[PDB]
Each structure stands twice: as C-alpha cells, then as structure tokens.
Amino acid sequence: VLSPADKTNVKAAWGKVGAHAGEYGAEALERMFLSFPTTKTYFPHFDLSHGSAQVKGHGKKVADALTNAVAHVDDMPNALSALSDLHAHKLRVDPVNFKLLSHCLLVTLAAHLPAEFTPAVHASLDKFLASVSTVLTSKYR
Amino acid sequence: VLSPADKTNVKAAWGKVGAHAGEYGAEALERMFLSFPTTKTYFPHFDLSHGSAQVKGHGKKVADALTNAVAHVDDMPNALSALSDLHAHKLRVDPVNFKLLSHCLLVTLAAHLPAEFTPAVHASLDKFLASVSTVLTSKYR
Amino acid sequence: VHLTPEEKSAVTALWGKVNVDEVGGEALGRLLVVYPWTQRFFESFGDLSTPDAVMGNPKVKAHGKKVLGAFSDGLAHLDNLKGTFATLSELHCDKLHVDPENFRLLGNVLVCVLAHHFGKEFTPPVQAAYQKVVAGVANALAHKYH
Amino acid sequence: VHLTPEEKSAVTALWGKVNVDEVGGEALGRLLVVYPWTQRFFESFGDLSTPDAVMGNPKVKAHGKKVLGAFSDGLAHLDNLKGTFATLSELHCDKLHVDPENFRLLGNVLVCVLAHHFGKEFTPPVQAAYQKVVAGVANALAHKYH
Numbered sequence: 154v155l156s157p158a159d160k161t162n163v164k165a166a167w168g169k170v171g172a173h174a175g176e177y178g179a180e181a182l183e184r185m186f187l188s189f190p191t192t193k194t195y196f197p198h199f200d201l202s203h204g205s206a207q208v209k210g211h212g213k214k215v216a217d218a219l220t221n222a223v224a225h226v227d228d229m230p231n232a233l234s235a236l237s238d239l240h241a242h243k244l245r246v247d248p249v250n251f252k253l254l255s256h257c258l259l260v261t262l263a264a265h266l267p268a269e270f271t272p273a274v275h276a277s278l279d280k281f282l283a284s285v286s287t288v289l290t291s292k293y294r
Numbered sequence: 295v296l297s298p299a300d301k302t303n304v305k306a307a308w309g310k311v312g313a314h315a316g317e318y319g320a321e322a323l324e325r326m327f328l329s330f331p332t333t334k335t336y337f338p339h340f341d342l343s344h345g346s347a348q349v350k351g352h353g354k355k356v357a358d359a360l361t362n363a364v365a366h367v368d369d370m371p372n373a374l375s376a377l378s379d380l381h382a383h384k385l386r387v388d389p390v391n392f393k394l395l396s397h398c399l400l401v402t403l404a405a406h407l408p409a410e411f412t413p414a415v416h417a418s419l420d421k422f423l424a425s426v427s428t429v430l431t432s433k434y435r
Numbered sequence: 436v437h438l439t440p441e442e443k444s445a446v447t448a449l450w451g452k453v454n455v456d457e458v459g460g461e462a463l464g465r466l467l468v469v470y471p472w473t474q475r476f477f478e479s480f481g482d483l484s485t486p487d488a489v490m491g492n493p494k495v496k497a498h499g500k501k502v503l504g505a506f507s508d509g510l511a512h513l514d515n516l517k518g519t520f521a522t523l524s525e526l527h528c529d530k531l532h533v534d535p536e537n538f539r540l541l542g543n544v545l546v547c548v549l550a551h552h553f554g555k556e557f558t559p560p561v562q563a564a565y566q567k568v569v570a571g572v573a574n575a576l577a578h579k580y581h
Numbered sequence: 582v583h584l585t586p587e588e589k590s591a592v593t594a595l596w597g598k599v600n601v602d603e604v605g606g607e608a609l610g611r612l613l614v615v616y617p618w619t620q621r622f623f624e625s626f627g628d629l630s631t632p633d634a635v636m637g638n639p640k641v642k643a644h645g646k647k648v649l650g651a652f653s654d655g656l657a658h659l660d661n662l663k664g665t666f667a668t669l670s671e672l673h674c675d676k677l678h679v680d681p682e683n684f685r686l687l688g689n690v691l692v693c694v695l696a697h698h699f700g701k702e703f704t705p706p707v708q709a710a711y712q713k714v715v716a717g718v719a720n721a722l723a724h725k726y727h
C-alpha cells in the first residue's frame with residue numbers, strides 16, 4: 154500500500170519525467186528486451202531494433218498508462234481496469250514479466266533523474282510499479 | 295480473487311482434511327525443506343530432522359491458521375491481520391518463499407485426497423494459497 | 436542436473452510406472468486450467484472454456500502425451516538435458532514464442548500430478564528429486580532462448 | 582558466467598570508475614530501505630528506522646564496503662565465480678542463514694545504483710551485461726546452500 158509520502162514521492166519523480174515519458178518508456182522497453190531476452194516472446198510481431206518506431210510507439214503507450222495511474226494514484230484499480238482486462242484476457246503476459254519491466258523502468262529513471270532518485274524516492278517508485286503490476290494482473294484468474 | 299465456486303471448492307477440500315491438517319501441515323513443511331533447502335534459512339533453530347517435534351508442532355500451527363483462513367474466506371485480511379504483522383515485522387520471510395510452501399501444501403493435499411483434488415479444486419486451492427500469501431506479505435513495506 | 440544415484444534411482448523407478456499418455460494429458464490439462472493465461476498458445480485446440488472442456492479436449496491430451504513423451508527421453512540424458520533439448524529450445528524460442536516461465540509452471544503441475552497419482556509413494560524425498568528434474572528440464576528447454 | 586568479450590570489456594571498463602567504498606554503502610543502504618525485511622540480519626547495526634538512519638549509519642556504510650569489496654574481487658574471476666564465492670557461500674548458508682534471494686535483491690539494487698551514477702553511460706547493453714554479472718554472483722553465492 155502507498156502511503157502519503159509514497160504518493161508524494163511518485164507525483165514528484167514522475168513530474169520531473171514530464172516530457173520524456175514516452176522516450177523513457179521506449180528505453181525501459183529496450184532495456185528489458187536486452188537484459189531479459191525471454192520478454193521478446195510477447196513481441197514477435199515487432200521490430201525490436203534500436204530505435205524501431207514500433208518500440209517508440211509502444212513505449213509511449215506504456216508511459217501514458219503510467220502517467221494516468223499517477224494522475225489517479227488514489228483510484229488505480231479503476232483507472233487501469235481496461236488495461237487489466239486486456240493483459241488478463243488478450244495478451245495473457247506471464248505475471249513474472251511485470252517485475253522485469255518494472256526493474257528496467259527503475260533503471261531508466263535512475264539514469265535520467267540522478268538528483269531526484271533518492272533512497273526514499275527509489276523505494277516509493279518501486280512500491281508504485283509493484284501496485285501497477287498487481288492491478289494489471291488482478292484479473293488473470 | 296476468490297469466486298463463490300473457489301470458496302465452495304476450498305471449504306470442500308479443506309473439510310475433508312479434517313483431523314489431518316496438523317499431519318498435512320507438517321508433511322508440507324517437510325516436503326518444502328527437502329525440495330527447497332533455502333527455506334531452511336528461516337528455521338535454523340528448529341531441529342529439521344524427519345519427525346522432528348518442532349516441525350510437527352509448527353505444521354499444526356500453519357495448518358490451524360489455514361483452517362481459520364478457510365473459515366473467514368471472505369475477511370482474510372482481518373482474520374489474518376496478526377499473522378501479517380508477524381510475518382511483515384518480526385519474521386520477515388522473503389515473499390518468494392510463500393510460493394514454495396504453497397506448492398508443498400498442494401502436493402501434500404494431492405497425495406492425500408486423490409478423488410477430491412480435481413483440476414477445478416486444484417485451481418481453487420492454488421488461488422486460495424495465493425491470496426493467503428498476499429495477505430501475509432501485504433504489510434511488508 | 437546434480438542428482439544423487441539414490442535420487443536418480445528413485446526418479447527412474449517411479450517414472451517406470453507412469454502411463455505417459457494420461458499423465459501428460461492430465462498435466463497439460465491442469466496447466467491450462469490453473470494458469471489460464473498459458474492457454475494463449477492453444478486457441479486452435481478448440482474449446483478450453485471449462486476444466487472439462489479442457490480436460491476432455493483431444494488436442495490438449497495428444498499435446499500432453501507429446502510433451503510428456505519428450506520429457507521421458509531427457510530422463511535418458513539426466514547428464515545432458517542441455518544438449519538433449521537444444522533443438523526444442525530453439526523451436527520454443529524461435530518458433531512458438533513460448534515464455535520459458537511456462538516450463539516452470541508445467542514442472543510444478545507435473546509434480547502435483549505425480550503426487551495425485553502415486554499418493555503415499557510420492558514421498559518428500561521422491562518429490563525433492565523430481566523437483567530437481569523438472570527444474571533441470573525447464574532450464575534445458577530455456578537454454579537456447581535469445 | 583558467459584559474457585561476450587565486449588561484454589566483459591564493458592563490465593570491467595565501467596567498474597574501473599566506480600568508488601567501491603561509497604557504492605557498497607549506497608547499494609547496501611538502498612537494499613535495507615527498499616526491501617525493509619532485509620533488515621532482519623542487521624539488528625546490531627542500530628537505527629534503521631528511516632532512510633537517513635539507514636543511509637548514514639556507519640555500520641551500514643562499513644558493511645557495504647565489505648560486500649562490494651568482495652563483489653569487486655569476483656569481477657576478476659568471471660570464469661570462476663563459484664570457487665571464488667565458495668567459502669562465502671558456506672558462511673552465508675551455514676552461519677548467517679541468509680536466504681539467497683537476498684543476493685538477487687542486492688544485484689538489482691546494485692544495477693540501479695550504477696545507473697543512477699553513470700547515467701547515459703549505463704547503456705541498455707551495459708546493463709544487460711551487468712544483469713548477467715549480478716545473476717552469476719547470486720548463483721555463485723547460493724551454490725553451497727543445502
């Protein structure tokens with residue numbers, strides 16, 4: 154569960170992302186494909202080459218879903234239900250992969266926000282991404 | 295999230311455990327310690343030998359808690375609050391371990407209730423153990 | 436995989452009483468039923484909307500016997516599950532796009548099917564050797580992913 | 582672990598620029614902060630009630646230096662992580678009773694510490710190589726558990 158400071162911490166860190174969300178989302182993705190090659194099994198229909206616009210296009214989507222969850226930090230289950238339905242019933246992504254992407258996102262953020270990526274902030278972002286992943290896998294069965 | 299069928303299915307299976315929960319609980323622990331030796335890092339103070347009394351005794355504790363879980367299937371959080379506190383603040387067993395034990399309990403049950411451990415009952419208990427596990431690790435951070 | 440000879444001796448001996456047909460049919464069926472997302476690879480198998488739809492589906496079954504059949508053979512190569520499954524590794528990666536995690540899931544359903552079927556005979560120790568087996572298989576199958 | 586030579590060249594190149602004293606204190610401290618349950622092994626370390634209590638604690642800082650100092654030496658032996666960490670594997674098992682999962686947690690926190698520190702310099706491919714390294718260490722450290 155996200156505490157007042159967790160929320161404050163994610164509103165702030167994500168606030169700084171501001172503009173680069175999509176750009177960062179795409180990087181997170183690239184980081185995941187490379188470090189956790191098994192993740193590529195869900196994107197067989199994609200161009201997974203450095204700078205593919207498929208990846209850029211998808212990174213943006215991911216980043217906006219995150220931006221939306223942040224904006225509805227207080228109602229995440231409802232904010233992302235369509236996305237849960239989707240992952241639960243169409244994509245059917247093994248829950249394990251949420252943890253891998255979330256890690257890549259943390260890496261990505263750490264890499265771009267040296268100043269804001271504090272132990273406290275790191276901690277809050279980690280719980281944040283975990284609840285997002287939780288929300289997204291809640292309807293799997 | 296437990297559906298009415300799931301709950302009905304857990305009460306059924308669990309009811310048939312009846313008097314052996316203690317016995318099954320200790321067997322589950324024994325299978326885990328042998329199958330997943332890393333789980334032993336948490337009971338350095340237990341004699342872990344076959345038929346050890348600590349194991350036997352602990353098996354009953356766990357069993358009983360499961361029974362209370364089954365009884366309060368609709369209010370687990372509250373039924374298991376003290377236990378969550380315990381695991382989150384004192385014990386601090388790494389969350390990944392909840393999965394090894396759950397599995398061990400599934401095997402235990404399969405091996406003792408041939409006729410009742412149906413694909414459907416199997417699916418249900420699995421979801422059950424998963425939610426118990428979630429409830430126990432819900433207050434970790 | 437590092438198996439003891441008492442470990443291997445015990446694996447071997449119970450494996451000897453497996454009806455691969457129905458045990459593979461049972462294992463794969465349960466997978467689809469317990470972890471429903473694993474169904475994403477089998478839309479072409481037909482109706483999987485119910486545990487019976489799944490359990491009694493002939494594709495599941497035959498696919499089960501096929502999978503379990505290949506399992507059986509690695510047992511003959513407990514010392515080289517790696518090279519035993521190299522081609523199947525590339526195929527599952529390169530062609531079927533199977534998340535290797537599914538392999539872990541299967542191994543655990545298997546272990547559960549064996550127990551169910553052998554009851555009392557599938558002892559803490561027999562389980563422990565088997566756990567080593569299905570983990571070695573999952574890893575051997577996950578071997579050539581890139 | 583099986584690193585490309587451009588991979589091992591990459592690992593090594595960057596590692597040359599890290600301050601082990603302060604990166605060790607930083608990765609250990611961050612572990613205790615983000616996965617507070619990991620604090621279970623450090624009651625004798627004193628106040629860990631807050632991120633600053635943790636991060637500025639001299640025992641936390643001094644322990645991080647040792648873990649990383651140790652990590653840094655496995656780096657010279659990428660081809661023999663297991664023998665490198667064999668005695669430390671036994672110490673952690675047999676005497677400290679540390680769940681190996683802690684090793685993986687730290688690896689990840691380490692990866693995030695590197696990123697934070699190297700910024701742009703910790704590229705997708707640089708990370709992928711370190712992911713390989715931290716995974717090998719976790720496994721090497723877990724090797725002797727029984």
Ligand code: HEM
Pocket residue numbers: 192195196211214215218219236240244246250251252254285286289
């Ligand atoms: C917190 C993590 C995640 C978020 C926020 C997220 C969000 C999204 C969104 C917004 C979409 C597109 C939906 C649309 O088209 O409207 C999507 C699609 C998809 N996601 Fe997820 N997802 C996450 C995790 C994952 C993971 C871990 C994987 C696999 C490793 C994955 C695999 C997919 C795939 C295969 C698609 C279909 C995309 C396409 O064909 O363009 N997702 N996700």
Ligand code: HEM
Pocket residue numbers: 333334336337352355356359360377380381385387391392393395396426427430
């Ligand atoms: C189904 C999941 C679990 C349940 C229902 C459960 C239940 C319990 C109960 C009822 C107690 C006793 C507290 C008391 O003395 O009143 C306990 C303690 C304990 N549990 Fe958990 N537990 C679970 C998972 C785990 C796991 C996975 C581990 C680690 C491998 C673990 C390690 C411990 C330890 C070390 C103790 C204290 C032992 C002692 O001092 O005798 N538990 N648990």
Ligand code: HEM
Pocket residue numbers: 473474476477501502503505506523527531533537538541542572576
């Ligand atoms: C766990 C060990 C497994 C083994 C040894 C195994 C083995 C096999 C074998 C021997 C084939 C036959 C391929 C051919 O030559 O045409 C096959 C096909 C296939 N398996 Fe795997 N399998 C395993 C697990 C899985 C799992 C867990 C899944 C997914 C949940 C899966 C999905 C498939 C699919 C989709 C095919 C292709 C089916 C077709 O030909 O229509 N397998 N497997």
Ligand code: HEM
Pocket residue numbers: 612619622623644647648649651652669672673677679683684687688718722
């Ligand atoms: C990840 C790789 C790791 C390495 C290379 C490493 C290395 C070391 C070394 C060199 C020592 C001192 C040995 C001695 O005193 O003889 C030590 C002690 C210790 N380690 Fe590890 N460590 C690692 C991970 C961890 C983790 C993740 C934890 C738990 C969160 C941990 C918990 C401990 C504890 C509690 C001590 C004893 C400190 C004391 O004297 O109270 N270690 N470690």
